[PDB]
Design an enzyme around this catalytic site. Structure first.
Site, PDB file in Angstrom:
ATOM      1  N   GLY C  10       0.803  -1.203   0.000  1.00  0.00           N
ATOM      2  CA  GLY C  10       0.000   0.000   0.000  1.00  0.00           C
ATOM      3  C   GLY C  10       0.842   1.261   0.000  1.00  0.00           C
ATOM      4  O   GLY C  10       2.070   1.240   0.096  1.00  0.00           O
ATOM      5  N   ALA C  12       1.082   3.830   2.268  1.00  0.00           N
ATOM      6  CA  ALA C  12       1.831   4.069   3.497  1.00  0.00           C
ATOM      7  C   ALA C  12       2.972   3.070   3.646  1.00  0.00           C
ATOM      8  O   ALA C  12       4.081   3.438   4.052  1.00  0.00           O
ATOM      9  CB  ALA C  12       0.894   4.015   4.703  1.00  0.00           C
ATOM     10  N   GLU C  71      -1.932   0.144  -7.228  1.00  0.00           N
ATOM     11  CA  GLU C  71      -2.038   1.303  -8.097  1.00  0.00           C
ATOM     12  C   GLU C  71      -0.639   1.863  -8.308  1.00  0.00           C
ATOM     13  O   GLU C  71       0.148   1.920  -7.352  1.00  0.00           O
ATOM     14  CB  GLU C  71      -2.965   2.371  -7.511  1.00  0.00           C
ATOM     15  CG  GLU C  71      -2.774   3.750  -8.097  1.00  0.00           C
ATOM     16  CD  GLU C  71      -2.324   4.745  -7.052  1.00  0.00           C
ATOM     17  OE1 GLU C  71      -2.209   4.354  -5.874  1.00  0.00           O
ATOM     18  OE2 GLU C  71      -2.086   5.918  -7.403  1.00  0.00           O
ATOM     19  N   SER C 140      -0.534  -0.057   6.218  1.00  0.00           N
ATOM     20  CA  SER C 140      -1.460   0.746   7.000  1.00  0.00           C
ATOM     21  C   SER C 140      -2.711  -0.062   7.332  1.00  0.00           C
ATOM     22  O   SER C 140      -3.098  -0.970   6.592  1.00  0.00           O
ATOM     23  CB  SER C 140      -1.852   2.019   6.243  1.00  0.00           C
ATOM     24  OG  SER C 140      -2.562   1.716   5.050  1.00  0.00           O
ATOM     25  N   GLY C 143      -6.012   1.866   4.665  1.00  0.00           N
ATOM     26  CA  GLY C 143      -6.209   1.706   3.240  1.00  0.00           C
ATOM     27  C   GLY C 143      -6.819   0.365   2.879  1.00  0.00           C
ATOM     28  O   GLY C 143      -6.773  -0.605   3.636  1.00  0.00           O
ATOM     29  N   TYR C 224       3.614  14.076   4.719  1.00  0.00           N
ATOM     30  CA  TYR C 224       3.953  12.661   4.811  1.00  0.00           C
ATOM     31  C   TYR C 224       5.461  12.457   4.862  1.00  0.00           C
ATOM     32  O   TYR C 224       5.938  11.503   5.489  1.00  0.00           O
ATOM     33  CB  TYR C 224       3.339  11.889   3.643  1.00  0.00           C
ATOM     34  CG  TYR C 224       1.932  11.396   3.913  1.00  0.00           C
ATOM     35  CD1 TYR C 224       1.566  10.946   5.176  1.00  0.00           C
ATOM     36  CD2 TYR C 224       0.969  11.392   2.912  1.00  0.00           C
ATOM     37  CE1 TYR C 224       0.281  10.499   5.435  1.00  0.00           C
ATOM     38  CE2 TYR C 224      -0.321  10.949   3.160  1.00  0.00           C
ATOM     39  CZ  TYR C 224      -0.658  10.503   4.424  1.00  0.00           C
ATOM     40  OH  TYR C 224      -1.938  10.059   4.679  1.00  0.00           O
ATOM     41  N   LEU C 252      14.977 -12.517  14.178  1.00  0.00           N
ATOM     42  CA  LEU C 252      13.556 -12.227  14.351  1.00  0.00           C
ATOM     43  C   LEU C 252      12.930 -13.050  15.469  1.00  0.00           C
ATOM     44  O   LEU C 252      12.020 -12.570  16.155  1.00  0.00           O
ATOM     45  CB  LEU C 252      12.812 -12.477  13.043  1.00  0.00           C
ATOM     46  CG  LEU C 252      13.192 -11.568  11.878  1.00  0.00           C
ATOM     47  CD1 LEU C 252      12.379 -11.935  10.649  1.00  0.00           C
ATOM     48  CD2 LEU C 252      12.980 -10.112  12.259  1.00  0.00           C
ATOM     49  N   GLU C 254      14.160 -13.714  18.263  1.00  0.00           N
ATOM     50  CA  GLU C 254      14.471 -13.111  19.552  1.00  0.00           C
ATOM     51  C   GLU C 254      13.514 -11.983  19.911  1.00  0.00           C
ATOM     52  O   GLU C 254      13.465 -11.580  21.078  1.00  0.00           O
ATOM     53  CB  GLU C 254      15.913 -12.603  19.549  1.00  0.00           C
ATOM     54  CG  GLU C 254      16.455 -12.262  20.925  1.00  0.00           C
ATOM     55  CD  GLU C 254      17.968 -12.119  20.934  1.00  0.00           C
ATOM     56  OE1 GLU C 254      18.616 -12.589  19.972  1.00  0.00           O
ATOM     57  OE2 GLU C 254      18.507 -11.536  21.901  1.00  0.00           O
TER      58      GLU C 254
HETATM   59  N1  LIG Z   1       2.507   7.608   8.462  1.00  0.00           N
HETATM   60  C1  LIG Z   1       2.030   7.530   7.222  1.00  0.00           C
HETATM   61  N2  LIG Z   1       0.700   7.229   7.020  1.00  0.00           N
HETATM   62  C2  LIG Z   1       0.205   7.146   5.763  1.00  0.00           C
HETATM   63  C3  LIG Z   1       1.019   7.362   4.662  1.00  0.00           C
HETATM   64  N3  LIG Z   1       0.259   7.215   3.553  1.00  0.00           N
HETATM   65  C4  LIG Z   1      -1.005   6.912   3.923  1.00  0.00           C
HETATM   66  N4  LIG Z   1      -1.052   6.879   5.290  1.00  0.00           N
HETATM   67  C5  LIG Z   1      -2.217   6.564   6.126  1.00  0.00           C
HETATM   68  O1  LIG Z   1      -2.810   5.397   5.601  1.00  0.00           O
HETATM   69  C6  LIG Z   1      -4.216   5.490   5.625  1.00  0.00           C
HETATM   70  C7  LIG Z   1      -4.726   5.263   4.208  1.00  0.00           C
HETATM   71  O2  LIG Z   1      -4.213   4.037   3.741  1.00  0.00           O
HETATM   72  P1  LIG Z   1      -3.299   3.918   2.421  1.00  0.00           P
HETATM   73  O3  LIG Z   1      -1.959   3.291   2.732  1.00  0.00           O
HETATM   74  O4  LIG Z   1      -3.114   5.277   1.789  1.00  0.00           O
HETATM   75  O5  LIG Z   1      -4.203   2.978   1.467  1.00  0.00           O
HETATM   76  P2  LIG Z   1      -3.591   1.844   0.496  1.00  0.00           P
HETATM   77  O6  LIG Z   1      -2.820   0.815   1.291  1.00  0.00           O
HETATM   78  O7  LIG Z   1      -2.722   2.482  -0.560  1.00  0.00           O
HETATM   79  O8  LIG Z   1      -4.851   1.101  -0.199  1.00  0.00           O
HETATM   80  P3  LIG Z   1      -5.909   1.778  -1.225  1.00  0.00           P
HETATM   81  O9  LIG Z   1      -7.273   1.774  -0.572  1.00  0.00           O
HETATM   82  O10 LIG Z   1      -5.962   0.929  -2.473  1.00  0.00           O
HETATM   83  O11 LIG Z   1      -5.504   3.190  -1.595  1.00  0.00           O
HETATM   84  C8  LIG Z   1      -4.566   6.867   6.147  1.00  0.00           C
HETATM   85  O12 LIG Z   1      -4.946   6.736   7.497  1.00  0.00           O
HETATM   86  C9  LIG Z   1      -3.276   7.647   6.071  1.00  0.00           C
HETATM   87  O13 LIG Z   1      -3.160   8.504   7.179  1.00  0.00           O
HETATM   88  C10 LIG Z   1       2.362   7.666   4.856  1.00  0.00           C
HETATM   89  O14 LIG Z   1       3.102   7.862   3.892  1.00  0.00           O
HETATM   90  N5  LIG Z   1       2.862   7.749   6.139  1.00  0.00           N
HETATM   91 MG   LIG Z   2      -3.390   3.535  -2.296  1.00  0.00          MG
END
Ligand SMILES: Nc1nc2c(ncn2[C@@H]2O[C@H](COP(=O)(O)OP(=O)(O)OP(=O)(O)O)[C@@H](O)[C@H]2O)c(=O)[nH]1
Ligand SMILES: [Mg+2]
Ligand SMILES: Nc1ncnc2c1ncn2[C@@H]1O[C@H](COP(=O)(O)OP(=O)(O)CP(=O)(O)O)[C@@H](O)[C@H]1O
Ligand SMILES: Nc1nc2c(ncn2[C@@H]2O[C@H](COP(=O)(O)OP(=O)(O)O)[C@@H](O)[C@H]2O)c(=O)[nH]1
Ligand SMILES: CN1CCN(C(=O)Nc2ccc(F)cc2)CC1
Ligand SMILES: CN1CCN(C(=O)Nc2ccc(F)cc2)CC1
Ligand SMILES: [Ca+2]
Ligand SMILES: [Ca+2]
Ligand SMILES: [Ca+2]
Ligand SMILES: [Mg+2]
Ligand SMILES: [Mg+2]
Lengths: 348, 423, 438, 54
Positions: C10, C12, C71, C140, C143, C224, C252, C254
């Site tokens: 994803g 994040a 994506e 995350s 997402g 970000y 790992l 440990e």
């Molecule tokens: N700390 C941090 N949080 C992130 C980042 N990008 C997204 N998030 C958090 O992740 C959540 C959204 O999930 P995403 O990771 O963007 O979704 P995804 O995994 O790409 O999946 P999709 O639904 O297909 O877009 C939100 O709560 C954001 O605050 C990042 O770069 N750093």
């Molecule tokens: Mg995404």
């Protein structure tokens, strides 16, 4: 415009605080399940502290201190005092107490029995009292105190019954003192200048602990099982102005010197002890809490701490003033609005 | 590479659709001839969402212009940006729909829909990954209302998993003097409820009151009404056209908690007519944007409750102060937001402002107060239908009365559905 | 030496991965083109850093990482970024349309069509491993891909690599940096189906990192980039024991031994300090005691919660910089007398200490200042269950009305999976209260 | 307050201090979950196309 929720409909105290806040035209009340609140008047049991302080852009305040039960429980208070070097097991204002668990279940049974036999052997007064936060027993035989606890299924605390309590005259009657203590978010310890004496309208009788009416000064036991209810003072409640004049005319002293100094000392010591554990100074939410301290005064004018109430009610004649003071120093001090304080700051 | 296919049908659909392409074309640095002449790379980064790239560095909108009469579309082709649209993408008839939903949906429109779908199919076949379609149309006429919904029902059959999004102009007795309007609107709402994922309710009733009351325009014209629709359409699509955090399906997942409740109340600030000199502060953007007088659905939000809200601020402004002002509106009127959908208010900021504004704000609301809109149409509808007045226009094209009763029931249920979540 | 493979899932998960591997190269002296002039064993070697980098005959040091996103926009950056040469194309996997913040769409719909491909790219990295330990999965909760596809991968990895440990780094959703309303749903769905497959997971609440940036770094509106730079420091502190010579947390396995006494209670709290802004005129360097004490301030924890009202099951101090055991014990003794640190009875009252002399590495042009010594505390506290309480509460508010549920049913998920996952979280909150309460 | 298992090396050291003593689905089962969810989507889309056909 601030907001607040109400989660304890039974709190006579914060019902007035809620009524006062709304009377300022600057506080809006929301449904109890509404998260966008500035102030929470939380429930007694299981208040969800873990959910406070996570609303972006909202400074949130609650009227309870997480961890204050360690002070307002019969068994917790005993454990706190003995295991805390600040108070130490040698604390000279707390009646010697023991945490006894019913045998159907650490425990201080054998330890409590040691000091008991010591008194019986030393011709000393050996009249204890068994009680619990959940039914009170006053007896000078240990076997009666333990059997009574075994007949129950919860924890009990057995402490030395003050056999020589200060008796008001006329009436030759017992009493206790309730002091209302307020601690704001910054941990300033304010003492309401007004206290009450919950007196027993029955003459204290040291030869009959079965008739727990002249011994238990509870307003409910006096107005129910006591037949002189309201004879000497109204509702078996004597305020400081009268109690002060009595000490001047009878003992040639005052309430500040003979009793209040010790009281203000006990309060400071207790709250200062648990401060590292409950302070919200660096926390994502703020806390305050009104406390009810209960003291006993013996014939020697020595003050003892009975218990500490976490959700205390107030005397009818003092609801208005005290509840207003809670809004001045505990609420508005965090959410200011667009004296001669009624509290005494216990500096530390 | 998340492409969107644009469809505009009918007089209102094309006049408003034309203004839309005019407005955003100016924001993406595309001239009337399709050549790019901007100064910010941010103009082209997401340009392929609504535009196609041709030889010689030409950008051609991904738009299909549909009408049953040549009248309006000759206006577009002779309009400012008329030379920008794809020539083939002009699909029109010669009979018209005479403000008759039946003619657009069943007779005159069916004779033409298959060719319109050959252009839709052609445009989709050139997309790397098609988000979905967007339709501009009115609900009170015959073509946009009747044939517009026919196109939706057929597109959904051919692209069942793509998102369908519409800008739909609701009729008002203050703008239109055509008696059958409530009939055409009720029939169309039945379709939209069943076959679209997101529908922006552009109420001509609200547009009129804004121009007459707020803007002080004594004799409002469609040019005045469509100035507000332009600004709003530019606003609500900003998240899609510029690098932001954006996806038609993602918007839907966060705006639509229940499939039938996909009708949004749009809002915009500052409301301006065709003398803005003074800078509008962020607190001013927020108050206006949430005040009812800036709503474009003709629904007092104070009468209902917000299921979800989305705000877009454009320009160079204190992003910190945006949070403050936004959270101030919530925490000062949280009785108008449902409490069983945590954090249902979201806000984004874009750095490129609309033309002629230091900064603006767009409001996208899924409010249960939208029921007042559907109640209004339903009252007007039933006043005539209980007397079966003007039905011969429709039964003459093959419709039965029962088909009216069904559309009436679907909409009154929608109102009842909105009313339950409001409590 | 035993290799560890990282999997970034994803947006994040990938952007955080790009921040960690950036820091890994700076800490190990690896250049953006994969060259490491310090490794005299050209073409290979079984050093501590090789647990994270493979080597080619040309001297390039290649991360043992797989980037997965449904994506392409986020991974295309890594394909043209500063370290574009570090990774070969096979390591970066992208689809065409994402999960639309829909757990079911990520797990069932889109996940089904790409699961067997990601597993095949992973197998290509495992084949380069003489002794694979396990995986570190970044993702995350919020997402659709981070929650939905991750849980699907965790089920598959447990099948294809049964005897291998799997640590997580999971981003707990915070409204202040999120525009999705259904993240509580996704967070709970993924924790339900992943719990049995994760051996140790370090949650990071974006609300915690967000405030640390505004409070300690004086960033009005943190981006970000600001967040991920700080998150990677914590990750670097936690992974250092696998990349550097040492004796604490050497593999790992440990981690679960030192931090997870109960399999379900495998969410250690992380506390890091000091966090100092590079824009400061010049900071008075903090002492071992001052930074050790800071590990018990809630403002430095990766999740806001009060450990004074939970019980500890394990505690681990990881120091980087000028630090000698003598001062550590001095700070510890001072903190015990002053702090409320309550361990569970069936556990010892002690701390495992790890000291790495190389002080924390700062990214040029970043926001963090160079400090002489830092520390990261890993504590398994029952107080972290407060996060599950908040998460579960928001879930309950929305699920009572079935709001947004149709989006998940529409992707093929049964409504029962909601209540099934929720009941599990109910059991998790009960397990925590059983351990930490009396 | 006791230190134990002191390990020293060029790049650092580690030790332990004690203050007080104490007192899966198969590959087949996953393929069925994925295909079951796929069938439900097929049934849902079939009923939609049936609706549109009528
Ligand atoms: N700390 C941090 N949080 C992130 C980042 N990008 C997204 N998030 C958090 O992740 C959540 C959204 O999930 P995403 O990771 O963007 O979704 P995804 O995994 O790409 O999946 P999709 O639904 O297909 O877009 C939100 O709560 C954001 O605050 C990042 O770069 N750093
Ligand atoms: Mg995404
Ligand atoms: N150690 C002791 N010596 C003498 N009397 C005692 C005593 N402990 C309790 N009492 C009597 O019992 C009363 C207090 O009882 P206790 O406070 O334990 O019960 P409770 O908590 O239900 C009353 P409250 O409403 O103040 O909390 C006092 O009036 C006092 O007279
Ligand atoms: N806002 C706006 N509304 C319009 C415009 N043109 C027509 N309408 C409204 O749309 C309805 C008439 O529908 P119309 O588009 O002319 O029907 P069609 O051409 O057969 O599809 C009436 O309610 C008009 O008020 C326009 O340019 N702007
Ligand atoms: C553009 N249209 C014009 C017609 N219209 C309306 O006014 N309906 C109505 C019907 C019956 C009645 F009695 C009163 C009004 C809806 C808007
Ligand atoms: C043939 N009629 C003439 C009157 N009429 C009109 O005045 N439209 C209008 C447009 C915009 C507005 F704001 C108000 C009214 C409707 C068409
Ligand atoms: Ca014909
Ligand atoms: Ca080498
Ligand atoms: Ca496993
Ligand atoms: Mg009591
Ligand atoms: Mg017309």
């Amino acid at each position: 415009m601030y907001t607040f929720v109400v989660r304890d409909e039974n709190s006579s105290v914060y019902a007035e605080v809620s009524r006062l806040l709304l009377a300022t035209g600057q506080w809006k009340r929301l449904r109890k399940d509404n998260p966008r609140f500035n102030l929470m008047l939380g429930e007694r049991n299981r208040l969800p502290f873990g959910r406070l302080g996570h609303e972006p852009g909202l400074v949130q305040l609650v009227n309870y201190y997480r961890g204050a039960d360690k002070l307002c429980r019969k068994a917790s208070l005993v454990k706190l005092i003995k295991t805390s070097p600040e108070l130490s097991e040698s604390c000279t204002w707390f009646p010697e107490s023991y945490v006894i668990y019913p045998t159907n279940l650490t425990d201080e049974r054998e330890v409590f029995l040691a000091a008991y036999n010591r008194r019986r052997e030393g011709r000393e007064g050996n009249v204890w009292i068994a009680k619990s936060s959940a039914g009170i027993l006053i007896s000078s035989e240990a076997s009666e105190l333990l059997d009574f606890i075994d007949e129950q299924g919860q924890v009990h605390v057995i402490q030395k019954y003050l056999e020589k309590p200060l008796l008001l005259e006329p009436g030759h009657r017992k009493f206790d003192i309730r002091s209302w203590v307020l601690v704001d978010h910054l941990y300033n310890i304010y003492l309401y200048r007004e206290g009450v004496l919950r007196t027993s309208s029955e003459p204290y009788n040291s030869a009959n602990f079965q008739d727990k009416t002249c011994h238990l000064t509870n307003h409910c036991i006096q107005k129910e099982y006591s037949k002189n209810y309201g004879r000497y003072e109204e509702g078996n409640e004597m305020f400081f102005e009268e109690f002060n004049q009595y000490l001047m005319d009878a003992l040639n002293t005052t309430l500040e010197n003979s009793i209040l100094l010790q009281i203000k000392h006990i309060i400071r010591s207790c709250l200062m002890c648990i401060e590292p554990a409950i302070s919200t100074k660096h926390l994502h939410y703020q806390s305050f809490q009104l406390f009810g301290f209960d003291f006993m005064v013996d014939e020697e004018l020595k003050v003892w701490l009975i218990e500490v109430n976490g959700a205390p009610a107030c005397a009818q004649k003092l609801y208005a003033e005290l509840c207003q003071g809670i809004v001045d120093v505990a609420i508005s001090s965090v959410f200011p609005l667009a004296p001669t304080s009624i509290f005494i700051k216990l500096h530390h | 590479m998340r492409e969107i296919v644009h469809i505009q049908a009918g007089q209102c659909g094309n006049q408003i659709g034309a203004k839309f392409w005019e407005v955003i074309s100016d924001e993406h640095g595309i001239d009337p001839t399709g050549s790019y002449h901007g100064d910010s790379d941010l103009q082209l980064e997401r340009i392929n969402v609504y535009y196609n790239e041709a030889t010689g560095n030409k950008y051609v909108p991904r738009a299909i212009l549909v009408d049953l009469e040549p009248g309006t579309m000759d206006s577009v082709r002779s309009g400012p940006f008329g030379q920008i649209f794809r020539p083939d993408n002009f699909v029109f008839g010669q009979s018209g729909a005479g403000n008759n939903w039946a003619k657009g949906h069943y007779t005159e429109g069916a004779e033409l829909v298959d060719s319109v779908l050959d252009v839709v199919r052609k445009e989709s076949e050139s997309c790397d990954c098609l988000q979905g379609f967007q339709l501009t149309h009115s609900l009170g006429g015959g073509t946009g209302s009747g044939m517009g919904t026919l196109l939706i029902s057929k597109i959904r059959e051919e692209y069942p998993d793509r998102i369908m999004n519409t800008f739909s102009v609701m009729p008002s007795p203050k703008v239109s003097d055509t008696v059958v309007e409530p009939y055409n609107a009720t029939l169309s709402v039945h379709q939209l409820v069943e076959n679209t994922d997101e529908t922006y309710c552009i109420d001509n009733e609200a547009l009129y009151d804004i121009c007459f009351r707020t803007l002080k325009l004594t004799t409002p014209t469609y040019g005045d009404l469509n100035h507000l629709v332009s600004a709003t359409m530019s606003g609500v699509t900003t998240c899609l056209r510029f690098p932001g955090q954006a996806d038609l399906r993602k918007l839907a997942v966060n705006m639509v908690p229940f499939p039938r409740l996909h009708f949004f109340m749009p809002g915009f600030a500052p409301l301006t007519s065709r003398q803005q000199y003074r800078a509008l502060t962020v607190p001013e953007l927020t108050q206006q944007m949430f005040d009812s007088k800036n709503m474009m659905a003709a629904c007092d939000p104070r009468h209902g409750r917000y299921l979800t809200v989305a705000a877009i601020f454009r320009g160079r402004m204190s992003m910190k102060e945006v949070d403050e002002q936004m959270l101030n509106v919530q925490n000062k009127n949280s009785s108008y937001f449902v409490e069983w959908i945590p954090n249902n208010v979201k806000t984004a900021v874009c750095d490129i402002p609309p033309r002629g504004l230091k900064m603006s704000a767009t409001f996208i609301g899924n409010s249960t107060a939208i029921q007042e809109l559907f109640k209004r149409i339903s009252e007007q509808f039933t006043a005539m239908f209980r007397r079966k007045a003007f039905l011969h226009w429709y039964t003459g094209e093959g419709m039965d009365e029962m088909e009216f009763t069904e559309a009436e029931s679907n909409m009154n249920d929608l109102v009842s559905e909105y009313q339950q979540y409001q409590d | 030496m035993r290799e560890c493979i990282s999997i970034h899932v994803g947006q994040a998960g990938v952007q955080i991965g790009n921040a960690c591997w950036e820091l890994y190269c700076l800490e190990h002296g690896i250049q953006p083109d994969g060259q490491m002039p310090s490794d005299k064993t050209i073409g290979g070697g079984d050093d501590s850093f090789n647990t994270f980098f493979s080597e080619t005959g040309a001297g390039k040091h290649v991360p043992r990482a797989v980037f997965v996103d449904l994506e392409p926009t986020v991974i295309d950056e890594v394909r043209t970024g500063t370290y574009r040469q570090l990774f070969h194309p096979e390591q970066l996997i992208t689809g065409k349309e994402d999960a639309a913040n829909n757990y079911a769409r990520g797990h069932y719909t889109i996940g089904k069509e790409i699961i067997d491909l990601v597993l095949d790219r992973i197998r290509k990295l495992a084949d380069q491993c003489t002794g694979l330990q396990g995986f570190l999965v970044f993702h995350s909760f919020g997402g659709g891909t981070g929650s939905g596809f991750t849980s699907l991968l965790m089920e598959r990895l447990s099948v294809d690599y049964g005897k291998k440990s799997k640590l997580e780094f999971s981003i707990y959703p915070a409204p202040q940096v999120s525009t999705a309303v259904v993240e509580p749903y996704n967070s709970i769905l993924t924790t339900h189906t992943t719990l049995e497959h994760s051996d140790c997971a370090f949650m990071v609440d974006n609300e915690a990192i967000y405030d640390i940036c505004r409070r300690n770094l004086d960033i009005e509106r943190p981006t970000y980039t600001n967040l991920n730079r700080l998150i990677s420091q914590i990750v670097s502190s936690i992974t250092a024991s696998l990349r550097f010579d040492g004796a604490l947390n050497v593999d790992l396995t440990e981690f679960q031994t030192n931090l997870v006494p109960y399999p379900r209670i495998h969410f250690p709290l992380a506390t890091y300090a000091p966090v100092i802004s590079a824009e400061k005129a010049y900071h008075e360097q903090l002492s071992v005691a001052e930074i050790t004490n800071a590990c018990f301030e809630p403002a430095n924890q990766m999740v806001k919660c009060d450990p004074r009202h939970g019980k500890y099951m394990a505690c681990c101090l990881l120091y980087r910089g000028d630090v000698v055991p003598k001062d550590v014990n001095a700070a510890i003794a001072t903190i015990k007398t002053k702090r409320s640190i309550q361990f569970v009875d069936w556990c010892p009252t002690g701390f495992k200490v790890g000291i790495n002399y190389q002080p924390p590495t700062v990214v040029p042009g970043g926001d963090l200042a160079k400090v002489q010594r830092a520390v990261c505390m890993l504590s398994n506290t029952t107080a972290i269950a407060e996060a599950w309480a908040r998460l579960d509460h928001k879930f309950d508010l929305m699920y009572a009305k079935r709001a947004f549920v149709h989006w998940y049913v529409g992707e093929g998920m049964e409504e029962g999976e909601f209540s099934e996952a929720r009941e599990d979280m109910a059991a998790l909150e009960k397990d925590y209260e059983e351990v930490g309460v009396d | 307050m006791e230190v134990i298992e002191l390990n020293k090396c060029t790049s650092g050291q580690s030790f332990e201090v004690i203050l007080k003593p104490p007192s899966d689905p198969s590959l087949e089962e996953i393929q069925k979950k994925l295909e079951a969810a796929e069938e439900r989507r097929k049934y849902q889309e079939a009923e939609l196309l049936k609706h549109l056909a009528e």
